[PDB]
Amino acid sequence: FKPRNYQLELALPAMKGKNTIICAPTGCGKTFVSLLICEHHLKKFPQGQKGKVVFFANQIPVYEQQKSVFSKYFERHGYRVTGISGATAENVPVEQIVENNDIIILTPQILVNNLKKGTIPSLSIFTLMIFDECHNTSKQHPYNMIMFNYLDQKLGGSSGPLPQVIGLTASVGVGDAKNTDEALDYICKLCASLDASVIATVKHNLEELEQVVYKPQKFFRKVESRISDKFKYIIAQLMRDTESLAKRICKDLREFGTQKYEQWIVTVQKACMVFQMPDKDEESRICKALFLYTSHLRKYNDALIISEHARMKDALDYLKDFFSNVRAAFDEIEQDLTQRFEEKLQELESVSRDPSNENPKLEDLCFILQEEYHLNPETITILFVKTRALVDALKNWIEGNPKLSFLKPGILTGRDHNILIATSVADEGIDIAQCNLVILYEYVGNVIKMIQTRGRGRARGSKCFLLTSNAGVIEKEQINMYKEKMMNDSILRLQTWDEAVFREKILHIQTHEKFIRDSQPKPVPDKENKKLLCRKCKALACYTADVRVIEECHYTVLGDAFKECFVSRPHPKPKQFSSFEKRAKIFCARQNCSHDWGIHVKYKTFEIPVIKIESFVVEDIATGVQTLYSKWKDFHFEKIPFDPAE
Template sequence: MKTFFFPETLSQIQNRDFGTQRYEQWIMTFQKKCSVLRLQDKDKESRICRALFLYTSHLRILNDALIINEHARTKDALEYLKGFFNNVRTAGFDEIEQGLTRRFEERLQELESISVDPSNENPKLKDLCFILQEEYHLNPETRTILFVKTRGLVDALKKWIEENSKLTFLKPEILTGRGKTTKDRGMTLPAQKCVLDAFRAHGEKKILIATSVADEGIDIAQCNLVILYEYVGNVIRMIQTRGRGRARGSKCFLVTSNADVIEKEKINLYKEKMMNDSILSLQEWDEKAFKKKIHQIQIHEKFIRDSQGKAEPKLDKKNKKLLCRKCKAFACHTADIRVIEESHYTVVGDAFKECFVTKLHPKPKSVGIFEKKAKVFCARQNCSHDWGIHVKYKTFEIPIIKIESFVVEDIATGEQRLYAKWRDFHFEKLPFDPAEMSK
């Protein structure tokens, strides 16, 4: 009997147009549901889950390219795709990936032609160029933060500024978050600090292109121009991003072609006015009455917290399997996992060594207690899913795995679950013991 799977039943997200962040959310939800798909035939389950993982991963990259094309240059979107398919060829590259790569290559010449056609120039980039030229003409000492929504756009706009003869004097720098996915590794905290220190100290870096990491908690006193490029959030984010412009006489521009974005910004402005009016109203209160009201609210909220309580997570002592999230190959049992300094997870025993392969780390270096040596990947043929890193810890060479790369399966029931962080997985966590390794 045939089994049919309908994508619409695996996600509640509707109105998912291509080239939007909403579509990316749909892809990610769909991919998670596919990863825990269970079939009686385990070989078939592995094949289907792996195929769906590949298809959704490619969809996500194609969606990123559409976003870049919409807000930057077609050339940048095409370079983004080329980089992705070059990486695909060096890892796994099974029949599905070969077919998807072939389809891209068949259209590559047409895409190259489109990318160099002057008639396809993005009008929003013309507007952005005009704003920057005008502001730096009025004040050559202007310092700018340009906010965008995605890391892909950060890279694309940096390249556009560097290749635009009218704007090269800006010498752009980038600032992004740490990254939560394999696709987007982002910047480390030391790298972020280095960029911010350079932007504050040196006048030659006149523009900082940033994602949401810079819209709160970062003080740049010299900044006097904030540009929101297709970038809008809630009223708090709006106030925070505009607040990045600390210098006297600072300005804020919103650049968008989306009517919904404009409407959302208008609503945020209205909410900001309501907030300011409320603050003025509160300042007219009698101080004694104000403190009494606050005390009443605090007592009420404490009562609610106490009545709800916070149940301690129940520790699951049952042994479970970790399966590769991409191909469902067996990796290890939870009984073989050990914890180093309460936050890093390794696997003991020789059996696990047969389940992974290593490749030299592209950026080997010492980080905290570890010396990064290599990357760890699934050993199953044509999978090569990223499982973590191989490090030197004291005198030991050990793998450090990340839970987001695995599906956790209950041995007794077959139930499968995904975890984004180790702290969310409440299993019996045994500490790493050097004596155990010595045996």
């Protein structure tokens, strides 16, 4: 092929064998850079020797793409390309697969798990490592675990040969740094994490690069929240009523429609779970009632937020679908609350259909769309929003707007079209259709994602609007821009340093961090038998004596006493994780409780339930004390390993 000069320039520090973090704008063709570095690396070895390259892709789509491209590129040169992902990782000779292939594409967790398991004895088997989106190397992220192994081998007493390390990123990030010095420290710490002595950027060839990747012009639209809202009043009345019904069965202990009230109502929901009675099949009644109350309050709050960021109709549809899910499941207070909702449904719908009441944010958004599509009818737009509810909401709003009829919206979420509505995309991901219009709707993110989003605006004349009713959002974007300045300046300063000095600084950052990392014990396990009841209906589910732990992670149940406590519905999203294969979802079997207990999976020969401690209440039969645990790791008792021999 025909590489651009800045690509050769970026690859040059790596082709000289130096561990290198390559920092270049999104969409500059880093793929061919990787191909160049890899080709040169593999061809440099004499006849009696051969190298082994490992490419780390953090996402399955990137995994498949890179595997495909590398395979098509290097097959002719006599280099075997393969890959190992979560799907193909089980019951396979991973060591042999690594050994028998020259280029191997991995998702990092495979290498982490296989290093920890011992199947891959050392990283010395690889002569080269490439980290895609290498800014992810930090904290507990798998990249950083791999690099922990690397640095432990390097700084350790007996150290074999180590692979060259090449990172790839659009932005290294400054962290929380408030000034260029702190930024410099963050960047140096990142370089220390990847053992990189060189940061490669485009300097000599800048004009060529700027003819390829163009920087989109960014505008900030500051609008105001709706002052016309009568919907919030009614829904607030409902919230007060339900609060009173919760205040009926309890005694005592800030604003409606905010995050703070969400925290409050969640914590309260937790509080109602620890309350106990001496006659406890009234507990099944009371705590279930309180659970339903707090849940409905939560949903109402969510509706208020949705109405704040979108149409009132979207909030009413949210609630309607919610109460639709309440039915087709005949509860208790549920019919009561449903009726109470239908009381105000007519008034609410009367308010939602009033054109005078419409959201000014959507008005301004519609304005932007209208103008830009009037000037350029061929415009491809991408619209980022915070939550999936907003995705569906703006989908329906665009489809239901006569003004926007020129739009043909589409959906992009987690787990033909003019405009694509999405939540967020981790890092760069696979290149999609170029968008000359990017709209950030109440969006807040870091500097890295800011720089990465520009990659959708690569063409000249691309535009990016940030639309919000909050000033904090805007100034967050601005401090992110300043952060970008600090980043570039700190990098430019580092590049002026002597390579040896930087190597040593990196060395002591590594050594210090390793001392700290080795400095960081074993908690005393309690053998007292507990009871696991339901967080909703407080019904007896398990005893901790019946609970076994599989692979130091998952928890299952043995006794047949549990088989009468649960029902099962076919899993909405069946998938196989590790050695487990998801089959069904598990719910409480008592009196339509239908609380989510966990999943039902196929493990080897056995088919067993797996439960989450997040879904249950802990009962100490000795002290009668009830407590709540978020993660199984925070629950300290005696966990008996799963034994197939029983």
